[PDB]
Amino acid sequence: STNPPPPETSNPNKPKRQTNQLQYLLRVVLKTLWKHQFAWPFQQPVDAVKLNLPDYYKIIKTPMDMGTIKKRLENNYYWNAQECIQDFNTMFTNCYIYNKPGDDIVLMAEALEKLFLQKINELPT
Amino acid sequence: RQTNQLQYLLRVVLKTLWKHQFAWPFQQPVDAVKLNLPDYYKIIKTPMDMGTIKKRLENNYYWNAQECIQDFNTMFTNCYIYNKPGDDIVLMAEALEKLFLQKINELPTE
Amino acid sequence: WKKAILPGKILKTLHIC
Ligand SMILES: [N]
């Protein structure tokens, strides 16, 4: 009954990349989602202890949240934008797997994912 | 809970296709009488639609993920058999099928 | 014709016959 440490946000030996697509994910995509009215349940790791979800980290093998994604973008974590896009998708999918369909938190993730895919549709080449 | 794969099929795969903008022609069985398709059941011997798949998943009727995947593939194939390949409904099915195969590629192991 | 009202009162039709 104890939360795992949050996901890694840096790499101990990797060049930081810096590209049109990576700056876009931080400056446009992450920023737009972060300020969304539904963002707040996703801005930090799931606190399974406080929320009394004893099975969350047994069911969700790769936890992910927007605070982690933001730090990964700020640090040297990603090799490319598609690695970051996968983290967003993992965050949404975790919510869909753990929670019942139609639950409020699932509806919120769906609205964030719809906005995310709209922003990804305009990813620079 | 359901097995990892069947739960994933309902909560990730079906939900994603169900709420897609192109889902609506596939959310219920084809009503060949109302649509005046006198040949539909002659051509399409095993109809299938996402409304039926959704009910089978929600009622725990499937024994495994393969039975559910086969139903999705039957739904797409039926659309391709009955309609002309350039038709809007075929383009819609193709886009749903592309999304389906992407989500199926990430099916969790049991 | 298949016809539907989508959320937002968006209307869609398809000429299946
Ligand atoms: N038709």
Numbering used by the authors:
A (entry chain A): 42 to 166
B (entry chain B): 58 to 167
C (entry chain C): 1 to 17
What does the paper say about this structure?
Within this class of proteins, the bromodomain and extraterminal domain (BET) family contains four members that are transcriptional coregulators and that recognize acetyllysines (AcKs) using a tandem pair of highly homologous bromodomains (BDs). Despite heavy academic and industry investment in this area, the generation of paralog-selective inhibitors has proved elusive because of the extremely high sequence similarity between the bromodomains of family members (90 to 95% within the acetyllysine-binding pocket residues). Using the highly conserved BET BDs as a model system, we conducted three mRNA display-based RaPID (random nonstandard peptides integrated discovery) screens using a single library (which contains >1012 unique members). Crystal structures of 13 distinct peptide–bromodomain complexes revealed highly diverse structures and binding modes among the cyclic peptide ligands.
Interestingly, the most abundant peptide (3.2A, making up 3% of all sequence reads) was related to only one other peptide in the top 500 and not to any peptides from the BRD3-BD1 selection. In characterizing the BD-binding properties of the three peptides selected from the BRD3-BD2 selection, peptide 3.2A proved to be problematic in SPR assays. Surprisingly, strong binding was not observed to BRD3-BD2, against which the peptide was selected in the SPR assay, although the peptide did reproducibly show an interaction with BRD4-BD1. Like 3.1B, both peptides bind two copies of the BD. In contrast to 3.1B, however, almost no direct contacts were observed between the two BDs, suggesting that in these cases crystallization might have promoted the bivalent interaction. In the 3.2A structure, AcK9 forms a direct hydrogen bond with Asn140 in BRD4-BD1-A, whereas the AcK2–Asn140 interaction (with BRD4-BD1-B) is water-mediated. A prominent feature of 3.2A is the high degree of internal backbone hydrogen bonding observed in the structure —nine backbone amide hydrogen bonds form an extremely regular antiparallel β-sheet connected by two turns. The 1D 1H NMR spectra of 3.2A and 3.1C also display well-dispersed amide resonances, consistent with the formation of well-defined and stable structures.
